[PDB]
Amino acid sequence: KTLLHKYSDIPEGTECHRKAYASTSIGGATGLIVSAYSIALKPPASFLEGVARTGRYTFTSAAIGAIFGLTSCISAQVREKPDDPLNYFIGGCAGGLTLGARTRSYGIGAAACAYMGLTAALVKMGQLEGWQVFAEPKV
Amino acid sequence: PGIVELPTLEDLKVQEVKVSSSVLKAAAHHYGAQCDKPNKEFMLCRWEEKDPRRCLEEGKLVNQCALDFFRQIKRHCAEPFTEYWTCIDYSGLQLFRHCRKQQAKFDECVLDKLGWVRPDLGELSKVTKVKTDRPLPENPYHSRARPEPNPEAEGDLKPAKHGSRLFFWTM
Amino acid sequence: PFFDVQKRLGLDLDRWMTIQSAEQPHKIPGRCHAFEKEWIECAHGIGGIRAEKECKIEFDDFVECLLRQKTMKRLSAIKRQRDKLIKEGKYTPPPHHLG
Amino acid sequence: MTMYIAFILSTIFVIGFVGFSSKPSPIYGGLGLIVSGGVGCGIVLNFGGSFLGLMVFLIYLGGMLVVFGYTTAMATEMYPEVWVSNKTVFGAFVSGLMMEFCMVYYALKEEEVEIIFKFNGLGDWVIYDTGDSGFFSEEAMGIAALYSYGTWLVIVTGWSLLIGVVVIMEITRGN
Amino acid sequence: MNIMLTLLTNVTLASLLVLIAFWLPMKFFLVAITFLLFDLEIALLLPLPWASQTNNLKTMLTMALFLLILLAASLAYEWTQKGLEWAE
Amino acid sequence: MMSGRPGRVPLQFLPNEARSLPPPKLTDPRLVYMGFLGYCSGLIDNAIRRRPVVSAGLHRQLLYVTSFVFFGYYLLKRQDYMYALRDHDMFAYVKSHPEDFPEKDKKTYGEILEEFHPVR
Amino acid sequence: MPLVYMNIIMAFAIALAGLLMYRSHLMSSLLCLEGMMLSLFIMSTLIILNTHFTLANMMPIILLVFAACEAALGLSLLVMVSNTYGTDYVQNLNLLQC
Amino acid sequence: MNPIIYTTLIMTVMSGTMLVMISSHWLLIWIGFEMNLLAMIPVLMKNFNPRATEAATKYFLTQATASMMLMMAIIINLLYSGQWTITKMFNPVAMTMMTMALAMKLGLSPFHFWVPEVTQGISLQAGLLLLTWQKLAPLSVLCQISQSINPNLMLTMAMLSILIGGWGGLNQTQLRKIMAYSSIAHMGWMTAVLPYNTTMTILNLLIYITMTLAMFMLLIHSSATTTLSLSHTWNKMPVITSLMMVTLLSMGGLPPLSGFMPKWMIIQEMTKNESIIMPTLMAMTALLNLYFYMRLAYSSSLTMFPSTNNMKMKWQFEHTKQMKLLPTMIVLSTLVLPMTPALSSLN
Amino acid sequence: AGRIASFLKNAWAKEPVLVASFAIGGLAIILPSLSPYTNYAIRINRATPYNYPVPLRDDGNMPDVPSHPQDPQGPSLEWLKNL
Numbered sequence A: 001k002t003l004l005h006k007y008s009d010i011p012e013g014t015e016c017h018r019k020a021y022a023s024t025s026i027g028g029a030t031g032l033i034v035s036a037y038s039i040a041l042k043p044p045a046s047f048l049e050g051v052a053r054t055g056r057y058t059f060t061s062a063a064i065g066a067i068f069g070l071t072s073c074i075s076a077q078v079r080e081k082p083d084d085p086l087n088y089f090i091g092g093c094a095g096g097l098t099l100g101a102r103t104r105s106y107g108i109g110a111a112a113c114a115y116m117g118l119t120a121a122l123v124k125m126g127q128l129e130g131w132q133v134f135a136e137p138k139v
Numbered sequence B: 001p002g003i004v005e006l007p008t009l010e011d012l013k014v015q016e017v018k019v020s021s022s023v024l025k026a027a028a029h030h031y032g033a034q035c036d037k038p039n040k041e042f043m044l045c046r047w048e049e050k051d052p053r054r055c056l057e058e059g060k061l062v063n064q065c066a067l068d069f070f071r072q073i074k075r076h077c078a079e080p081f082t083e084y085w086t087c088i089d090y091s092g093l094q095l096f097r098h099c100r101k102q103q104a105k106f107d108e109c110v111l112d113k114l115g116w117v118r119p120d121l122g123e124l125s126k127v128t129k130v131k132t133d134r135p136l137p138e139n140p141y142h143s144r145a146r147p148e149p150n151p152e153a154e155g156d157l158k159p160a161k162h163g164s165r166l167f168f169w170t171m
Numbered sequence C: 001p002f003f004d005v006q007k008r009l010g011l012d013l014d015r016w017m018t019i020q021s022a023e024q025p026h027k028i029p030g031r032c033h034a035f036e037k038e039w040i041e042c043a044h045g046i047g048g049i050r051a052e053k054e055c056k057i058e059f060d061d062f063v064e065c066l067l068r069q070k071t072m073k074r075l076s077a078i079k080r081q082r083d084k085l086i087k088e089g090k091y092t093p094p095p096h097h098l099g
Numbered sequence D: 001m002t003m004y005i006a007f008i009l010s011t012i013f014v015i016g017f018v019g020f021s022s023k024p025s026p027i028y029g030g031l032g033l034i035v036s037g038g039v040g041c042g043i044v045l046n047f048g049g050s051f052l053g054l055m056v057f058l059i060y061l062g063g064m065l066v067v068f069g070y071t072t073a074m075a076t077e078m079y080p081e082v083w084v085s086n087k088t089v090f091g092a093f094v095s096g097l098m099m100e101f102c103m104v105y106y107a108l109k110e111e112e113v114e115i116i117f118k119f120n121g122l123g124d125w126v127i128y129d130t131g132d133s134g135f136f137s138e139e140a141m142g143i144a145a146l147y148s149y150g151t152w153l154v155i156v157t158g159w160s161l162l163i164g165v166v167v168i169m170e171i172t173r174g175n
Numbered sequence E: 001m002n003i004m005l006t007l008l009t010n011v012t013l014a015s016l017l018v019l020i021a022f023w024l025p026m027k028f029f030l031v032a033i034t035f036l037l038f039d040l041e042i043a044l045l046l047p048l049p050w051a052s053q054t055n056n057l058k059t060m061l062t063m064a065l066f067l068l069i070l071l072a073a074s075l076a077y078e079w080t081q082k083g084l085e086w087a088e
Numbered sequence F: 001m002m003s004g005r006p007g008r009v010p011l012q013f014l015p016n017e018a019r020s021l022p023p024p025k026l027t028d029p030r031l032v033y034m035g036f037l038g039y040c041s042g043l044i045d046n047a048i049r050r051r052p053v054v055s056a057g058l059h060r061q062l063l064y065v066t067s068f069v070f071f072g073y074y075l076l077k078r079q080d081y082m083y084a085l086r087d088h089d090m091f092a093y094v095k096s097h098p099e100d101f102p103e104k105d106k107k108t109y110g111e112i113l114e115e116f117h118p119v120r
Numbered sequence G: 001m002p003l004v005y006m007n008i009i010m011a012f013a014i015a016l017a018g019l020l021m022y023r024s025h026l027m028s029s030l031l032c033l034e035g036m037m038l039s040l041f042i043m044s045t046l047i048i049l050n051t052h053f054t055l056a057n058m059m060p061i062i063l064l065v066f067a068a069c070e071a072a073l074g075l076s077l078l079v080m081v082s083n084t085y086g087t088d089y090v091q092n093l094n095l096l097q098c
Numbered sequence H: 001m002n003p004i005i006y007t008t009l010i011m012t013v014m015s016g017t018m019l020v021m022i023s024s025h026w027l028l029i030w031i032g033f034e035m036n037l038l039a040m041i042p043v044l045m046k047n048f049n050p051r052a053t054e055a056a057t058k059y060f061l062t063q064a065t066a067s068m069m070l071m072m073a074i075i076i077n078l079l080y081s082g083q084w085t086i087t088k089m090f091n092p093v094a095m096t097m098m099t100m101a102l103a104m105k106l107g108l109s110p111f112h113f114w115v116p117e118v119t120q121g122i123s124l125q126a127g128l129l130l131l132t133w134q135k136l137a138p139l140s141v142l143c144q145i146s147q148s149i150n151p152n153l154m155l156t157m158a159m160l161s162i163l164i165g166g167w168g169g170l171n172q173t174q175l176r177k178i179m180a181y182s183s184i185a186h187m188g189w190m191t192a193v194l195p196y197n198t199t200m201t202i203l204n205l206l207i208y209i210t211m212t213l214a215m216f217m218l219l220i221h222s223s224a225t226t227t228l229s230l231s232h233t234w235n236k237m238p239v240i241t242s243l244m245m246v247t248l249l250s251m252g253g254l255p256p257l258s259g260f261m262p263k264w265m266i267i268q269e270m271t272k273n274e275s276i277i278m279p280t281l282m283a284m285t286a287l288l289n290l291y292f293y294m295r296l297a298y299s300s301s302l303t304m305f306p307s308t309n310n311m312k313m314k315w316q317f318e319h320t321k322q323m324k325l326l327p328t329m330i331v332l333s334t335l336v337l338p339m340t341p342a343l344s345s346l347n
Numbered sequence I: 001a002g003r004i005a006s007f008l009k010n011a012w013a014k015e016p017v018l019v020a021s022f023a024i025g026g027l028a029i030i031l032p033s034l035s036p037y038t039n040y041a042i043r044i045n046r047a048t049p050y051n052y053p054v055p056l057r058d059d060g061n062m063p064d065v066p067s068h069p070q071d072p073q074g075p076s077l078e079w080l081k082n083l
């Protein structure tokens, strides 16, 4: 989880350039994973078409992370409140707008803001209270 | 993890036997049946102590006792011994079945000049009650302490209090 | 096993081979029989959780025995330092290293 | 040279694996593994595994792969291929040896290869153990225990191989 | 030392012998699979000569015939149910 | 979990020490439920065979009911046994390590303050 | 972990990659399937022969006797698909689409 | 297949799987897996149709390598530990190799891709053995080595199993394909708690086996393989369709039906281990299973699809198969929920 | 018995091969039990030593083990000599 540590180590509301670049890396990293699978299960055309598919998938995933990290961090600076879960929501769903921008669909962009923002808010709660998704066997 | 202290070079100068394999194996049985006293407790040291370093004192004695046996032949029928061991080497397996006549010549000589009888079949392959002075090691493997086992389960069985106790199920 | 039928029946099916400190053909020892005896005797009736922390010194000594790793790190740096100290011409190897 | 015989055999093992796993024409692919089986014996022999290595020469290397060579005779493509015939197989061959070549370079420099497992690049001879084997030939008496200590392994080997013959002729029965 | 040296010189002479003479001038599959199974079962009883020197040869005795019986049994099935009789 | 407990003989459905517990009462409500389960199987059986569900083959239903009640009974003995076994070593464990279950210092409500929250 | 151990497991790793990189020939994949059990045999033998685990010499042969048994059925499986398709090409091994 | 040979071949699979659960040696665990693999291929090739050969080829190609991958972590664990006893793995990468190797023998993660088609290609009875008896042998190993498996790897693969299994069932027609996707979803359910508690994994196994075996081999009684074909069965045997809906609703897990037995107990254990987001999403995607469960019940008994005139012929005849152990198997797979304390018996 | 003896001779006429091997396997599997020498074979096999007969410390009252390799006490394989 080197990339995950790269993001979470940066304190909220500061070093926005580092937080953005970390956001691009995490968004970029998941771009390769989804594109490599897409090439595998669905065989593309000649290699230039394959990388064209790979480029599109990586571009959106990196773009969703890029803007999300920017706005999630500057919001803490501007609003002077890093702890609020809304600080991730306002940028967490803007990634859905970015997805809609690269897919050219108002409906899918708006719906993605409905969902991604909620999940991005939920991630902030997870770090705050101490939520664990893959909890170790305790009992 | 510590020190690997081992004996110096001082005690590692024994009068090493300068013979070869054929002459070693030509006698063999007679040497085994006449120098068992330093062989048995040294080998017993090798097994009980489980460490070469602690059996250096017995290690030199067996080599030294070999010389007394070996030079005893030189003051005796060593010429038949030379003819024997110079016929064993010629065989690639160093086998006795092709040198029976010299086997007799060595045996008949050693039978009366010294008296070392030929060890009968299976006599050497025998566990022996070798007398020894050293006490047995308290832990040959130098084992450390042992973890205390978990407390033993006991007590007469009692009915599960209030039954299954799983959600609303009773009895 | 899931259904340890060996324990109920009492007949040995594969336990003879499970470790190399059991009986072996004509008493041939394993390369690490001594450490197996120590680790196994250390960890019995202790459970699979307690033994992994308590009987660790025995395991560490044993886990080194099979694939001797730390001691080559000992040997590798011996070779590295010896090579460096002879390449520039300071340490002269003794004749016992040769004929 | 002579001191690196297990190392040199091991790297020929890899290049043989790279060549045949790159999937050339199947009859040529068999050869790529046959030499790998050939140099595989040397590693086993050099470590005292005289019987096990030689055993692999009779079965498998001189055995089952003959059937593989047999199978590629009647059930073959009309145009069997070669590393020149296709470009991807040519690229795979170069990639495998380059990856191997870059790896031994890493092994020879610092001997501190950490990829997946932690390896040491020292000489192959160090792992050997010093001590006489008496007269019993360790390996030879180890697999001779097949009938003294084998027990369960014997019946399951017999049964599965016997079950190996009910399955075969049944599937190639032609309805 | 001597083993691979012997292999090396044998290869060189054989390779030269052609070069000096080159520059200077379902049934078949079915039996093969049965061969593979029998040849593989043969690998089981190969270490028999050393196995005949154990201290419990009784267990060695009965189980050795068990492999040979099963080779006989596997042959028997492949025999009667047409099988080894080649397809037409 | 309690696989690996000291003394658990493998593949023993009912360990001998389980007999120290009170055996299930003859008409156990748990036991008679398996009698209901057996009865339904007989009723369902005739349905697939296209037979009078309530009247066809009283021999078939009798075997169905008897087997379910019987197999339930031993399963019901191991039922309470494991729960008794689970509670047994539990009760002894709290005594062997008193440090982790300390005395809960009982204090009446006259001491503890509960903050009141208006409901308007 | 010496180099001789490394070259074998790495050979297994590249053998594993080629096995699941099916080209247009099932025989080649079956051949690349052939790699690991030999790599497994070699890897097992060095471990067992080195450590003088006398009884464990069982398993190298035990590994080979059954790991070749799939090859017994696999080849007949290959000839079976080549008796209906007339070709070991794997692109036609997709009739189970729906 | 001559019945004597067919009976022996199933016995070998019976023996091969039984060997795994009774073995204490890592080799012997791999030993029976190979025998079990060696014996099923002829069973799958029961009709010798080209589709059956396709299914057998896919199953062999995805299982033989798993046994080969199985052996790989065995020697690596042997290399770093030196013991073949079935215990915790003392080397991390070996068990990382192990969990993937065992799972792809089974198929939960993308490894699962072979399960759908292979079930479809083979016969309905052959599909039963692959889907109700082949899930015990890998689970037997996972139960024994559950002490130290990496929780992150196992739970992720369990998530993907129920998420991919439920999602693919919605867009499936052949009842064999819905069976595979339903099984994939349930396998993640039973293996999700595997790192946490082993008893409720075996609980799910007995519960899942009973309903799956009952409703598979009841579907054999209907002699149907498509939703339309299953739809027609209401006119011939409306009792069969009525029983079909009961197990289908049990299959989803609606109380008080016994199919809610695993889903309830799993959520209880994961909650006990402070893992609470994990069950909720785990429970949520179970609705996907219910949807195509409910869709099949819609076309089976809850409505009446049009029949055919030629089907009046079938009314004059009757089935000949004796539905061995079928009738009792619905009863203990849809009504055994009040017998919930039986969990302790499995311990 | 007449037909069985006829059948065995019936076998030998139309085939001499597998009847001979069936006979060979039949005897080779049954004589092992009916043997006065298989006990000698295991006795001979164990008699041959491959390892050093590790001596035991003499704590007194050892009745049968010898102190000298030529001492009469201990196991003797003279039964092999005349064998």
Ligand SMILES: CCCCCCCCCCCCCCCCCC(=O)OC[C@H](COP(=O)(O)OCCN)OC(=O)CCCCCCCCCCCCCCCCC
Residues within 6 Å of the ligand: A004, A007, A023, A026, A027, A030, A034, A038, A056, A057, A058, A060, A061, A064, A065, A068, A069, A095, A103
């Ligand atoms: C706080 C730390 C993190 C900070 C940064 C924020 C997280 C990283 C950035 C956001 C990641 C999640 C959002 C989705 C990313 C991938 C989007 C993508 O691939 O879009 C392309 C495509 C959508 O279009 P498509 O479905 O292909 O249809 C049109 C085809 N012409 O879709 C595809 O091709 C793929 C299929 C659809 C998407 C499937 C799910 C992908 C995401 C999985 C979860 C990733 C979670 C990452 C964060 C947590 C873990 C680190």
Ligand SMILES: CCCCCCCCCCCCCCCCCC(=O)OC[C@H](COP(=O)(O)OCCN)OC(=O)CCCCCCCCCCCCCCCCC
Residues within 6 Å of the ligand: F043, F047, F051, F052, F053, F054, H237, H238, H239, H240, H242, H245, H246, H301, H302
């Ligand atoms: C938990 C939630 C609910 C779960 C269950 C829900 C079930 C219904 C769900 C909807 C199903 C789909 C829609 C309806 C489908 C109907 C299926 C069918 O086959 O219907 C027609 C069929 C005709 O009847 P037939 O098969 O001839 O049998 C008559 C009785 N011999 O009818 C039948 O085959 C029905 C046969 C019914 C047999 C009833 C037997 C009653 C036995 C009573 C025993 C009383 C004992 C009393 C003891 C007292 C002392 C203790």
